[PDB]
């Protein structure tokens, strides 16, 4: 019962997330009802949201995954194993903060001739923006705080919390 | 409401999976209570189980991901971004069938000097084995047929079903 003792405040509960993914999943299913999109998870943080969102998205779709790191220079650690040419792409993310990561990826998929590119993110932190980037679908907006949980790490830990929270001061030493 | 029409039988319901991940998560949390393991998801299929299992695993842990493609020759498409040297590794998988994929990965992590290597899989199909390989933790045993859902694809589709099922014969046509 240790991680919970590191959390100062639960910002978004597991029950809130469960309701929101049920809602978004049905809306996204209708949006994509006449195509087989490629849903692309941005590793590592997107995995819990992507799993639970797409379980609630009752439509035919395919999945793939990318890994990126990050001065404004973004590096691909793992590229797709699927062509995006002529595909409808849905990028799945855990948080948009500065906007850098998704600005890079959207331009990459447009360069590769995607038919359309949309974004769904669990969390959006609009106060963090350094470039203009908005998602098509957003679970929750969050304040200008470092959050963890439901995919989001502090030094690679806490991703497995089933809720989104803020850390206690002492955790930062 | 269309994928369901492709399914002849639900083998394992969403409620069954939810109960089993709750049980396994608590067991695994105790096993790993005195270490920070590296949980490694085998893409693409492991993502739904890994998300839902680790949300129910109340312990400190880190995550990473690998992608492989199976003659018996296994190909790494995406390697880890984390060293396994001296780490306790938990491999997370959706199904073990022939055993090839995981026999490859276990040997790779031992070669890289992991302190320990264990496996948790959602499904196990013991009738499919071509090499000797057993997981430390198994959600469900399944019979000798092709299943889809909860991560498992037919031609990259059906991974987003929230249950495990068998496809109607017409789908193969
Ligand atoms: O909008 P940005 O300012 O670009 O920040 C958002 C990105 O940063 C985090 O990923 P991180 O690089 O920490 O990798 P991780 O997902 O593996 O934790 C987060 O999951 C997003 O991908
Ligand atoms: O025990 P085996 O006979 O080795 O079969 C098990 C593997 O095969 C499937 O993966 P697949 O190669 O289809 O890739 P996927 O996970 O991306 O679907 C499955 O998800 C396991 O990883
Ligand atoms: N865990 C975590 N990662 C990032 C990356 C950008 N913003 C955040 C945040 O608020 N929390
Ligand atoms: N979808 C799916 N993939 C694999 C890969 C090995 N066995 C199976 C199975 O039964 N179903
Ligand atoms: Mg990320
Ligand atoms: Mg991070
Ligand atoms: Mg697989
Ligand atoms: Mg497969």
Numbering used by the authors:
A (entry chain B), B (entry chain A): 0 to 69, 77 to 179
Task: Quote the study on this structure.
HPRT is a purine salvage enzyme that converts purine bases and PRPP to GMP and IMP, which are precursors of the essential nucleotide GTP. To examine the molecular determinants underlying (p)ppGpp regulation of HPRT, we turned to Hpt-1 from the pathogenic bacterium B. anthracis, which pppGpp competitively inhibits similarly to B. subtilis HPRT.
The HPRT-substrates structure diffracted to 1.64 Å containing two molecules in the asymmetric unit, and PRPP and 9-deazaguanine were coordinated by two Mg2+ ions with each monomer. We noticed a significant difference between the ppGpp- and substrates-bound tertiary structures in the conformation of a flexible loop. This loop, also called loop II, is common to all HPRTs and covers the active site during catalysis. In the substrates-bound state, loop II is instead shifted ≈4 Å toward the active site from its position in the dimer-dimer interface. While crystal contacts likely prevent loop II from completely moving over the active site, PISA analysis predicts that these changes abolish the dimer-dimer interaction.
